[PDB]
Amino acid sequence: SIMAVTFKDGVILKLTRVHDKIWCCRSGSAADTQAIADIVQYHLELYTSQYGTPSTETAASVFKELCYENGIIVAGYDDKNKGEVYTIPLGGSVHKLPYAIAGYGYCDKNFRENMSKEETVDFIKHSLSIRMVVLTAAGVERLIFY
Amino acid sequence: GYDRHITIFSPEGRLYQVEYAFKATNQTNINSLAVRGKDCTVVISQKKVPDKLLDPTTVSYIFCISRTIGMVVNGPIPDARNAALRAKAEAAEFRYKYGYDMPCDVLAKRMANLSQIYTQRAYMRPLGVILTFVSVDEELGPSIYKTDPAGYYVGYKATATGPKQQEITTNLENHFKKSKIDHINEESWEKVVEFAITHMIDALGTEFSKNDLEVGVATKDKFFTLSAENIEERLVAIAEQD
Amino acid sequence: SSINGGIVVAMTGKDCVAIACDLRLGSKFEKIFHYGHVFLGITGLATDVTTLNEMFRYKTNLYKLKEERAIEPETFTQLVSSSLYERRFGPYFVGPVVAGINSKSGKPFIAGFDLIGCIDEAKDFIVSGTASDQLFGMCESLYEPNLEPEDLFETISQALLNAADRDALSGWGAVVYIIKKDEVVKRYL
Amino acid sequence: VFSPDGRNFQVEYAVKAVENGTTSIGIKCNDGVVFAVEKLITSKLLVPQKNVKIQVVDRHIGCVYSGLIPDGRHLVNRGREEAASFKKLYKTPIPIPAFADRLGQYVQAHTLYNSVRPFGVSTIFGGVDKNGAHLYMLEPSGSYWGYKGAATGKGRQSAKAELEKLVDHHPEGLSAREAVKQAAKIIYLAHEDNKEKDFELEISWCSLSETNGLHKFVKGDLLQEAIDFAQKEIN
Amino acid sequence: FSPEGRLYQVEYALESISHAGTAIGIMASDGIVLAAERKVTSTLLEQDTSTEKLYKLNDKIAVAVAGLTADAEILINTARIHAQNYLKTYNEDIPVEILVRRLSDIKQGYTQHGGLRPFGVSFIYAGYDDRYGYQLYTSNPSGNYTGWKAISVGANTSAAQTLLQMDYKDDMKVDDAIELALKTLSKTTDSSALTYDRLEFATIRKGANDGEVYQKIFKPQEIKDILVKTGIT
Amino acid sequence: HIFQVEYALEAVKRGTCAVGVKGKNCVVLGCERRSTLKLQDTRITPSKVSKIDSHVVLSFSGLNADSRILIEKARVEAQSHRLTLEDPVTVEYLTRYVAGVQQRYTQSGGVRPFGVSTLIAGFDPRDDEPKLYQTEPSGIYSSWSAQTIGRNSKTVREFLEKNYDRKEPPATVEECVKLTVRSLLEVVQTGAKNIEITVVKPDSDIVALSSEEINQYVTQIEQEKQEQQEQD
Amino acid sequence: AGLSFDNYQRNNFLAENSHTQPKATSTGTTIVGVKFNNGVVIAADTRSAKLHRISPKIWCAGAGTAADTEAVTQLIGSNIELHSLYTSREPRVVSALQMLKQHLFKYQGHIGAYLIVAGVDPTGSHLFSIHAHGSTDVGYYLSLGSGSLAAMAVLESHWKQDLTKEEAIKLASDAIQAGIWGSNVDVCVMEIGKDAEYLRNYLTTTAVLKESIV
Amino acid sequence: RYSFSLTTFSPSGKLGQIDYALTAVKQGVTSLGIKATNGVVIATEKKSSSPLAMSETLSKVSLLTPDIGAVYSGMGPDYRVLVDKSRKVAHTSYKRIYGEYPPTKLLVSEVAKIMQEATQSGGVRPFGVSLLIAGHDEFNGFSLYQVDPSGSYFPWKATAIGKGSVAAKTFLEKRWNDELELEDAIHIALLTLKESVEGEFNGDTIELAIIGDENPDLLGYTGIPTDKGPRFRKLTSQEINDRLEAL
Amino acid sequence: MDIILGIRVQDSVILASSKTRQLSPHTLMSFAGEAGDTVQFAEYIQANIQLYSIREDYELSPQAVSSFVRQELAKSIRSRRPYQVNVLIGGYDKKKNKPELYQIDYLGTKVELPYGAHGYSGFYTFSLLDHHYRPDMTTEEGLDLLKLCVQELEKRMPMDFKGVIVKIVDKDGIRQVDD
Amino acid sequence: DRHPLESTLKNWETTQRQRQMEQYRQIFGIAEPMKRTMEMEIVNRTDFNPLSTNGSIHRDILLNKECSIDWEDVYPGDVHSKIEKQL
């Protein structure tokens, strides 16, 4: 029902901006996951004020503090690294992954590292058998398909 | 008498502790200036590292509070860093409570209301600092707001603070008396910086190198502090202009 | 029947209001209370009825001391609504009805309320009780707009006589107030 | 809590408690920070393995202090808490400049309310982080700035005079081994005015080349090489 | 707050009421009178749209204040809230002594904690209840209280008590107590003359038409009447 | 420190005289009351000796206002003890509690000590020993057979030291009353209107004396004193 | 302090013993928000009073429990007036939205307000909806209440970039009528340069007597 | 730290600290109010920190409720903190319980209570401002109050506080009468501030507001005829210059 | 096991049990129900009314103690499951000169009554008292009407209730009676 | 048996301020929580006034509570008892 995946220029992904280059994708309660994203957005704005722009590993770290009471996909980009995706499955467990989904082995069955945008966009449209966001060095891009 | 050690009125109706906190704003021997352009607001500060052992990239009084707002502090560096971390937190708290970026006027009111608590309580001292906040506010445009140890706050057309503030202020007033505008008429922040540096030079009599100045600029997008090389482009421009 | 759950009716005439209720259903407990010129009827539990009298007496006596005037019907209508919304979780088991004349305009006004305080205003009549579905049909049949005081008394008392079941005396035992700019008269039936 | 000069009286008295302190200096090199401390001996009872005056913060930051011992230990403990809690949280060693603000704000916090007292200590600290070598001095007011070299405790004036001569003669910057030698010269020269008591010298360093960006005490050959340097220059 | 043989801050609060208008309470066989003088008036003060000195606490109890009117209204709201808590709990109007003892209990507390100054006010509590009938009480900044037949507080208290001691009779009616209150005030006040704009008046009367007590706080026209009847004009 | 506890004892010396003596089978608390002024309300003048529970009674010298707060605190604790332990409080426990609250207001700073010294008297439940106690502003407390506090207390302490013997306590209430009236008369140089006396007897017999019963004790004392002056 | 829980358990005991609990009134009919070329519009079917004011330019339509929709809108309308006075800036719809979202989240959907929020401010026109758990939604046309599937079928079938006032009011009126199997409609119209216009009802001797007083 | 209670009584029974706060009030820039048959006027001078200040950014005359407004003499920081608590008490105590904004007198008893609590508390000084509260109420009509640092409030017909107060009150007593209208009262207020203004006298150095008729234009919505909107109006700088041209 | 019964007469109240507390020398509380929670409540009420009677030198009226007991019971049920309890408060008012009887049920529903009961005492006792009762009864007629009513219960409940206790309040205060 | 929401709202203000003081520890270090705790002590310690039911006005300038109100401010729900509880 939700997906994130890495590709040559960054990552492709109930989508919400916790920072300009760090986005969250949500499942379960829209009330609780929006309360979490609003507090993560407050925390990353507060980190940015004191240290400059956060790493995506810091954003995943901030989500652990707030999800500790009650999983979510975290994804983003920075001027050094390639784009990244993290997951927090059932709470307490944590991973850093080239791709993630939530709601199947079908994903890894077709997935390929360092794909082009067009391959990955077709891959997600096939795998969701609607809105999609693309994060890169150059900027933020919005897509939709139905 | 006893009236001087805690914030309590003397027989004159004066709060002596607040007047002593004002004398801490003269303590650093630094002059600062802020001016409004057509589409930016610009802050110039003196920088005074006397002894060779200092690292001058660590001697700064320009603090960036949010994306779009920053400040210059006049008064002691420890109390300045205390004022800056509150301003950072309360601009991020306002964004969380109200869902839009903290406007400059409201940050000045908020910090001035906190300064009133310490200007009345007898177990909390006033901070020794004057805070000048600068932004391009999306409703009011180019903004300068100044907060002082008494919890007073006001908005300015231009402002100066330091030991020699009356000289700079006299030159600014005589400039706006010449043009009859509320602001510097230049349409880019480089030319506004070159104006403010020329007024700081004309008022304070010293020429500046890259090492003697600190500069900050607020625009629609961001607030940013100039590197010593970009201040050299500006001083080369004043030397190219004449 | 027991002391809880009896009927209250309120009705607006020309420069007058009636509020009326069932008296004892056996062989003394009133449900209409007055705080100067504003009248509160309360169907509901007998414990909440008496808790609300004691609570509104307190709040209204302090209002008269603070403001140097009696509470007007609209201001009392807002006070009962805000004071029943405290207790949003586990509310009072009541249906309050308010009736009075505003001292400035001298104009009849009435309202009803629920366990939380949502306001029904009406330019007509208001009803509360466990069995209001019969009595609302009677009031709607009998009610003429812009009645005089004595006709208005017969209209509301015929409504109570038509809905009060025949199982006891004088039709049935009831209280009626006629509320008027500078007078109030209480009739026991 | 204020005076006609606009200054805190209690911080003006706390710096008099530091003017009497046991000497320390720090030198910034092209690639690291070098610290040297006076360790005065009043009795032979002093256990050498138990006697130390340079403290370690996070295992990558060096810390030396002059003034009151209870207050200096309280800052080093809080420095260890702040450097450790950064590492648990952002998964990287705390920056030296970032560690100078958390500590300076703690010292400044004690200057605000009459129901607490200013810290009676000056701390010289620094190290190597992601960006490079940074050296700081933190005073009883919470005042701190970066330095190329700094001195505190009784010898501070003689030490400053020699530190200025280092930067005058070596404006290209100097490497860690020649700085260790010159640190021993500054500290032995700074004992011109207390010559009638014995003092041990303790050195530590933190260099991108010489210690792989971690703090180490200087012992064995480099320590004795520095003692032999300082003693030939002073005689 | 370091008491020597005496509690200084309470001595100084009792000096404070001696500068602050004058108020008189006179009990009678049928009711009670309260009477007070407002301090010197500027013409532009709005004197029909205030009570300065006399305040209602419930339907059966009133106070006359001398001292700081800002302090008074903190105690008065507390007494109003206490009187309605007792009526809510016991379904009976509060006895006068329980209200006086509660306010005297709070006024002693502001005399015992080092953070609080004592309240600069001394009241005159008139009221009625079924235990004792008509009761007239007085309370001080010290938090002690006593019952009286005829009491005065504020400026010139000893001159007023001298006049009350010679004119007061135990079986006076309320209308004799009106004249005595006015006689006492016009001999006592630091003024050239006495006029209806400087006075406040109240009474508590039983009535031959009822078994229940009526409380009146006098409007400015009714004060003119008692001044022309009593020959003060 | 001295700067209130010695001076609270001075305020206790300014307050009216309070006396208590044990009998064989009763205890009598007596107190001086200041002369009622010409316009004072006599019918509600408070009792000066204050009942805490049906067996326990407190008299004081010092500040009236402070005394009323200690008396209220003693009343609420005696009932909270019955309610939680299902027994009437002992006179020792009630004294221990009153002395404790006086001590909490002495140690703490911020608050001042209570300017009141108290005589506490009664009989324990189901028992026949009369008990009499003093509390100081210091929180110190002690058992006494016979004691006096307030104005002129040493002229009563002299009189009691001459007239009262611990091993021949007055065997009858009437002797015990006569001894405390004779003592009270030493400080109350007015008559039988300035003295207030209360008798405790076992099983909750607490009796206040009226002015007429007091005047016939003062009449006996005056005519016995006059027999002993009609004799040379 | 706050909303008291005090007679819970006692009221459950009363209901379990068959004293029936009186039922809170529910405005379970349709509400829509038809935005237009220069502003946003909102409308409500009024049957069995239902447009609420947060500020002169910020308005709500409610559904769910009637007392709750009025209590939350009048509480936030009091926190937004104080923020307007505190900052000297005209109140913003995004501030109203945040204060409502954080309040409905505090009370975990036990406060039964389903709420369209619309208005105009110095940043433009805005239209949002809040569900009782604290969920926020945003769009060009919104509907809530019992007929909202039929209303959204009408709204999506006719909505167009730059409807004029007349077309937006007619569309909102038609979408509400599609929530009916007539009834009156309350609507108000918030146009960016101008004061908000509220268009009410736009869809045009047998018994013995004694003697007493009180 | 204990026994730090300020505001203690002097041997003469005077509070001392309140007299010093009334000395801070007496050095504040003049403000005044006048009551007419059909409104109230409240007026004050603005004093510049420099002519580089934007005197638009510090309002002295302040809206408490749509029918009640205020002005001060004394310390500005203290008044700014009182006015936002005063606005908060109008909502929490009155609007949220009764659906109505409080009467002038009640909102004058709540402001006075904040200033009283600072006069009987430890470790706070009194408020150095003598606030003013002129409002409107259906039952009481138009009203004007003075509130002092002591937390004591008085109803006035016409009054003046601050530097020029004794010369202003002399003039208000010579000018005031029971037949005044609001356009007469504004002429008296402007004539009276012309006597204390040693600076320049313009619609930029005067602040002036009125509580008078209802203003449905300033309400900002239409079609709810129960509501009729603000009684409080602050005169724009050219409305003051129009009146000063005829003066 | 449970019965409270009470009857009011011309110048007395009679209360009957089987418990009870003397709240004041002219007032009794009789209660029945959940035997842990009702005994604690009676002692809490007894302590507070004894405190008022110590702190004021004075008898609190039967109305005021009854309304106080009705206001304590309502607080007890807030943040609790309501315990089964029933309370009769009977006393003599010396300002009005009347015997007065109030029943308070387990929700704080207060009613002033000529007679009342709680427990297994269903409409049989009330049918007897309805035909027999008169307001103008002497205490002797009152006690014998109680004896008729006790005999209807003793017929109808053969698991004998081990003898009642009876107490009378009048002008002189409480008396315990020897039937 | 109690309402699902009761425990959560009994201690909402303390929970939200504890969560916030943890964020100031994480971002700014022990200094910011410590300074803000110490200010709140002075404001709760001084101003002790056993009749002042409202809570402090300066306490609304520390909590960030100038234009933010809620049902705990609308519905707020012995002098020697308060003296001893403070001390």
Contact H54, B159 (CB under 8 A): no
Q: Which helix (H) or strand (E) holds G45?
A: strand G39-46
Which structure tokens are listed for C151? 């006709």
Residue G26 φ then ψ, to 5°: -120, 125
Contact A67, A91 (CB under 8 A): yes
CA C121-C125-C131 angle, 5° bins: 105
Which structure tokens are listed for G135? 């969920």
d(CA H120, CA H136): 31
| Contact partners, residue C37, CB within 8 Å, separation at least 6 | C70, C73, C100, C101, C103, C179, C184
Chains H, C in contact: 3+ Cβ pairs under 8 A?
yes
3-class SS at C19?
A: strand
Decide if J76 and G1 are in contact by the 8 Å CB cutoff: yes
**Counting beta carbons within 10 angstroms of the beta carbon of residue E41, is it exposed (0 to 12), middle (13 to 18) or buried (19 or more)?**
exposed
Q: For chain C, what are the domain ranges?
A: 1-189
Task: For residue G5, list chain J residues with Cβ-Cβ distance below 8 A.
Answer: 2-3, 5-6
Nearest to H156 by CA among H120, H208, H104: H104
d(CA E211, CA E133): 12
Q: For chain F, what are the domain ranges?
A: 1-227
Tell me which residue has tokens 């569900």: G131
CA D16-D20-D26 angle, 5° bins: 105
Nearest to E129 by CA among I60, H81, D208, H4: I60
Nearest to D203 by CA among D39, D57, D80, D31: D39
Task: For residue J46, list chain H residues with Cβ-Cβ distance below 8 A.
Answer: 4, 121-124
How distant is the Cα of J85 from the closest Cα of chain H, in angstroms? 16
- Breaks in chain C (C to N over 2.5 Å), named by the residue before each, are 27
Contact D209, D167 (CB under 8 A): no
Domains and their CATH numbers in chain I: 1-179 (3.60.20.10)
Long-range contacts of H170-174 (CB under 8 A, 24+ apart): H171/H195, H172/E44, H172/H32, H172/H34, H173/E42, H173/E43, H173/E44
Long-range contacts of B86-94 (CB under 8 A, 24+ apart): B86/B111, B86/B114, B87/B63, B87/B111, B87/B131, B87/B133, B88/A46, B88/A49, B88/A50, B89/A46, B89/J24, B89/J28, B89/J32, B90/J64, B91/A49, B91/B65, B91/B66, B92/A42, B92/A45, B92/A46, B92/A49, B92/B66, B93/A42, B93/J64
**Counting beta carbons within 10 angstroms of the beta carbon of residue D70, is it exposed (0 to 12), middle (13 to 18) or buried (19 or more)?**
exposed
3-state helix, strand, coil in chain A (%, to 5): 35, 30, 35
Contact C175, C189 (CB under 8 A): yes
3-class SS at E201?
A: strand
How distant is the Cα of A77 from the closest Cα of chain B, in angstroms? 19
Decide if H96 and G188 are in contact by the 8 Å CB cutoff: no
d(CA B13, CA D148): 49
User: Chains contacting J with at least 3 CB pairs below 8 Å?
Assistant: A, B, C, D, E, F, G, H
The CATH number that domain G29-214 falls under is: 3.60.20.10
Cα F12 to chain centroid, rounded = 13
Residue B187 φ then ψ, to 5°: -95, 5
d(CA C162, CA F64): 68
Which structure tokens are listed for D6? 């606009």
3-class SS at A3?
A: strand
Domain CATH number, residue D223: 3.60.20.10
d(CA H187, CA I154): 94
First vs last Cα of chain H: how many Å apart?
59
Does residue C71 come out as left (phi exceeding 0), alpha (psi in the -120 to 50 range) or beta? beta
- Encode D87-134 in three state secondary structure: HHHHCCCCCHHHHHHHHHHHHHHCCCCCCCCCCCEEEEEEEECCCCEE
Please list the residues that pair with D133 across neighbouring strands.
D128
* CATH fold for the domain made of F1-227: Glutamine Phosphoribosylpyrophosphate, subunit 1, domain 1 (3.60.20)
| Contact partners, residue I154, CB within 8 Å, separation at least 6 | I160, I161
Which structure tokens are listed for G139? 């769009």
Number of H helices, E strands in chain A: 4, 10
Q: How many CA atoms lie within 13 A of E136 on its CB side?
A: 25
List the single residue in F with minimal CA-CA distance to E144: F65
Sheet strand arrangement including F27-32:
F146-149, F18-22, F27-32, F195-201, F205-208
Q: Does B18 touch chain H (CB under 8 A)?
A: no
CA dist list (Å): D16 to D197, E69, F94: 22, 52, 56
How distant is the Cα of J5 from the closest Cα of chain C, in angstroms? 10
Residue G178 is given by DSSP the state T
| Contact partners, residue E192, CB within 8 Å, separation at least 6 | none
For E186, other C-beta atoms within 10 Å of its C-beta total 15
Q: Which domain holds residue D85?
A: 1-235
d(CA C68, CA E55): 11
Torsion of CA D202, D208, D210, D214, to 10 degrees: 50
3-class SS at A7?
A: strand
How distant is the Cα of D109 from the closest Cα of chain J, in angstroms? 6
Which structure tokens are listed for C64? 């008269």
**Counting beta carbons within 10 angstroms of the beta carbon of residue D106, is it exposed (0 to 12), middle (13 to 18) or buried (19 or more)?**
buried
CA D204-D205-D206 angle, 5° bins: 145
Helices (H), E25-168: 69-90, 96-109, 157-167
Torsion of CA G174, G179, G183, G184, to 10 degrees: -50
Domains and their CATH numbers in chain H: 1-246 (3.60.20.10)
Q: Does J80 touch chain F (CB under 8 A)?
A: yes
CA A38-A43-A45 angle, 5° bins: 95
G87 in catalytic set: no
d(CA B167, CA B204): 8
d(CA G149, CA G154): 9
Tell me which residue has tokens 């220069």: G38
3-class SS at A17?
A: strand
Nearest to I72 by CA among I100, I38, I98: I38
| Contact partners, residue C60, CB within 8 Å, separation at least 6 | C35, C36, C70, C71, C76, C79
Cα E51 to chain centroid, rounded = 12
d(CA C189, CA G206): 10
Contact E75, E103 (CB under 8 A): yes
Nearest to F30 by CA among F54, F49, F55: F49
Among the partner-chain residues C69, C79, C104, the one whose CB lies closest to the CB of H98 is C79
Among the partner-chain residues H11, H151, H159, the one whose CB lies closest to the CB of E70 is H151
User: Chains contacting E with at least 3 CB pairs below 8 Å?
Assistant: C, F, H, I, J
Number of H helices, E strands in chain B: 6, 10
Sign of CA dihedral D57, D59, D63, D69: positive
Q: Which domain holds residue E34?
A: 1-233
- Encode chain F in three state secondary structure: CHHHHHHHHHHHHHCCCEEEEECCCCEEEEEECCCCCCCECHHHCCCCEEEEECCEEEEEEECHHHHHHHHHHHHHHHHHHHHHHCCCCCHHHHHHHHHHHHHHHHHCCCECCCCEEEEEEEECCCCCCEEEEEECCCCCEEECCEEEECCCHHHHHHHHHHHCECCECCCCHHHHHHHHHHHHHHHCCCCCCCEEEEEEECCCEEEECCHHHHHHHHHHHHHHHHHHHHCC
First vs last Cα of chain J: how many Å apart?
36
Tell me which residue has tokens 């030296």: D96
Residue B104 is given by DSSP the state H
d(CA C60, CA C70): 8
Contact H92, J73 (CB under 8 A): yes
Please list the residues that pair with B93 across neighbouring strands.
none
Exposure string over I14-32, b if 16+ CB within 10 A, otherwise e = bbbbeebbbbbebbbbbbb
Which structure tokens are listed for F174? 């009437």
DSSP-derived pairing of the beta strands H40-45 and H31-35: antiparallel
Contact E31, E205 (CB under 8 A): yes
Helices (H), B57-211: 77-98, 104-117, 165-179, 189-204
- DSSP secondary structure of C59-117: HHHHHHHHHSSPPPHHHHHHHHHHHHHTTSSS---EEEEEEEE-TTT--EEEEE--SS-
d(CA C92, CA C49): 9
Task: For residue J67, list chain B residues with Cβ-Cβ distance below 8 A.
Answer: none
Domains and their CATH numbers in chain B: 1-241 (3.60.20.10)
- Encode chain I in three state secondary structure: CCEEEEEECCCEEEEEECCEEEEECCEEEEEEECHHHHHHHHHHHHHHHHHHHHHCCCCCCHHHHHHHHHHHHHHHHCCCCCCCEEEEEEEEECCCCEEEEEEEECCCCEEECCEEEEECCCHHHHHHHHHHCCCCCCHHHHHHHHHHHHHHHHHHCCCCCCCCEEEEEECCEEEEECC
Sign of CA dihedral B2, B4, B5, B7: positive
Sheet strand arrangement including F141-143:
F49-53, F56-62, F116-123, F130-135, F141-143
User: Chains contacting B with at least 3 CB pairs below 8 Å?
Assistant: A, D, G, H, J
Q: Does E87 touch chain C (CB under 8 A)?
A: yes
The structure was resolved experimentally with cryo-EM
Residue F157 φ then ψ, to 5°: -65, -35
**Counting beta carbons within 10 angstroms of the beta carbon of residue B142, is it exposed (0 to 12), middle (13 to 18) or buried (19 or more)?**
buried
Torsion of CA B187, B192, B193, B196, to 10 degrees: 180
Contact C162, C138 (CB under 8 A): yes
d(CA H118, CA H147): 14
Q: How many residues does chain G have?
A: 214
- Breaks in chain G (C to N over 2.5 Å), named by the residue before each, are 48, 181, 204
Residue E197 φ then ψ, to 5°: -75, -25
Sign of CA dihedral C6, C12, C13, C19: positive
Q: Does J3 touch chain C (CB under 8 A)?
A: yes
For D48, other C-beta atoms within 10 Å of its C-beta total 9
Q: How many CA atoms lie within 13 A of F158 on its CB side?
A: 6
3-class SS at C20?
A: strand
Please list the residues that pair with G39 across neighbouring strands.
G36, G191
Which structure tokens are listed for D181? 């030698």
Task: For residue F51, list chain I residues with Cβ-Cβ distance below 8 A.
Answer: 54
The CATH number that domain C1-189 falls under is: 3.60.20.10
| Contact partners, residue B37, CB within 8 Å, separation at least 6 | B142, B183, B184, B186, B187, B188, B189, B191, B192
d(CA C1, CA C155): 25
**Counting beta carbons within 10 angstroms of the beta carbon of residue B84, is it exposed (0 to 12), middle (13 to 18) or buried (19 or more)?**
buried
Letter for the amino acid at D129? D
Tell me which residue has tokens 């909303």: G3
Which structure tokens are listed for H72? 């001060």
Q: For chain G, what are the domain ranges?
A: 29-214
Letter for the amino acid at H239? E
Contact I39, I79 (CB under 8 A): no
Which structure tokens are listed for F147? 């004691």
List the single residue in H with minimal CA-CA distance to F109: H2
- DSSP secondary structure of J53-74: TT--STHHHHTT-SS---HHHH
d(CA J11, CA E41): 53
Task: For residue J6, list chain C residues with Cβ-Cβ distance below 8 A.
Answer: 89
Letter for the amino acid at F87? D
| Contact partners, residue G2, CB within 8 Å, separation at least 6 | J9, J70, J71, J72, J75, J77
What's the longest Cα–Cα distance across chain J? 43
Cα H2 to chain centroid, rounded = 37
Exposure string over A101-131, b if 16+ CB within 10 A, otherwise e = bbeeeeeeeeeeeebebeebbebbeebeeee
d(CA I1, CA H12): 74
Chains C, A in contact: 3+ Cβ pairs under 8 A?
no
Q: Which domain holds residue A88?
A: 1-146
| Contact partners, residue E11, CB within 8 Å, separation at least 6 | none
Axis-axis angle for helices G66-87, G93-106 (nearest 10): 130
Nearest to H186 by CA among H41, H46, H67, H61: H41
Sheet strand arrangement including G136-138:
G51-55, G58-64, G113-121, G124-130, G136-138
d(CA B191, CA B188): 6
